[PDB]
Amino acid sequence: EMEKEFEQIDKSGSWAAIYQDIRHEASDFPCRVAKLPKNKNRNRYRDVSPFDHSRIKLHQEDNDYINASLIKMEEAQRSYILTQGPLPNTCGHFWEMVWEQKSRGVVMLNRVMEKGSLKCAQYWPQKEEKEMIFEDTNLKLTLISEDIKSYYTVRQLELENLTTQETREILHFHYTTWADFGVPESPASFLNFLFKVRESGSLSPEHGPVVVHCSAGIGRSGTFCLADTCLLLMDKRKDPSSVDIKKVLLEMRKFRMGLIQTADQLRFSYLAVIEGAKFIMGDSSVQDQWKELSHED
Numbered sequence: 562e563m564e565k566e567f568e569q570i571d572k573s574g575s576w577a578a579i580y581q582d583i584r585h586e587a588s589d590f591p592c593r594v595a596k597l598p599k600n601k602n603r604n605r606y607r608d609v610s611p612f613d614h615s616r617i618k619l620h621q622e623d624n625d626y627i628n629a630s631l632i633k634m635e636e637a638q639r640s641y642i643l644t645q646g647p648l649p650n651t652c653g654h655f656w657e658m659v660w661e662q663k664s665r666g667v668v669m670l671n672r673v674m675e676k677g678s679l680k681c682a683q684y685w686p687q688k689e690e691k692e693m694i695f696e697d698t699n700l701k702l703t704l705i706s707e708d709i710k711s712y713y714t715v716r717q718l719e720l721e722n723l724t725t726q727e728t729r730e731i732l733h734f735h736y737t738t739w740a741d742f743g744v745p746e747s748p749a750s751f752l753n754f755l756f757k758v759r760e761s762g763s764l765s766p767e768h769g770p771v772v773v774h775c776s777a778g779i780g781r782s783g784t785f786c787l788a789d790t791c792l793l794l795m796d797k798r799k800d801p802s803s804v805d806i807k808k809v810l811l812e813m814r815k816f817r818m819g820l821i822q823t824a825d826q827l828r829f830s831y832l833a834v835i836e837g838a839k840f841i842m843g844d845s846s847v848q849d850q851w852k853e854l855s856h857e858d
């Protein structure tokens with residue numbers, strides 16, 4: 562049981578050892594396509610690649626490679642696409658993937674510039690009047706509106722397939738204060754943001770998988786997905802004790818390497834899930850408590 566275990570681990574100060582054990586037991590699968598010489602400029606990081614078996618394939622005849630993985634959580638019945646922050650040459654691929662996979666939301670957990678370096682291309686328009694056209698993939702992207710809060714921004718984008726002129730609404734959920742290799746300010750702040758993604762409909766099974774990224778797409782993205790999946794699992798059963806956080810993370814790591822980069826992110830994942838359990842088990846008022854504690858104004 563997560564809460565009991567949580568305090569056992571805190572008591573011993575053994576989060577590094579627990580986290581290390583998950584690293585040691587995690588799956589190892591080939592990333593042959595990612596390592597092909599022609600894909601070198603499609604990878605942001607040399608050591609972060611999608612497994613071949615779970616990689617997202619673009620629907621183009623030329624080169625179908627993107628650094629993106631489908632995390633298909635069978636028992637929870639939820640899927641996510643975890644991907645790196647697009648590069649200047651992969652922004653067209655990124656939006657092509659959003660289109661072909663029928664995603665409704667994009668969750669971005671990083672800033673474009675972090676610690677003085679460019680962690681992510683400016684892949685969406687910052688101004689209504691300056692829309693973006695990705696000529697390589699024949700897509701057009703327009704900012705429709707923006708709702709700026711203290712630590713996150715929600716954007717309403719319109720994505721158009723120029724070949725067919727069909728248009729779709731994409732919701733962009735942008736957490737702007739979550740540092741690389743860091744943890745959110747509080748369980749409340751993280752959960753307030755997670756429930757706004759859930760309260761967008763973007764995670765619904767009638768849509769394609771939500772796209773989740775930060776810079777590499779494994780650490781903050783892993784944390785976000787682990788908490789969400791764990792809450793969903795106990796929601797389906799209405800049974801918080803049936804959820805094994807470490808086994809869920811190991812299951813997720815069969816689909817993308819390196820999910821959760823630090824032991825404190827794992828520890829934070831426990832915190833977020835334990836706190837979110839109060840909502841799942843019937844205390845609806847906690848949701849407004851999180852919003853207050855998050856100080857989004």
Ligand code: VO4
Pocket residue numbers: 671741742775776777778779780781782822
């Ligand atoms: O850009 V990350 O170090 O949260 O995978």
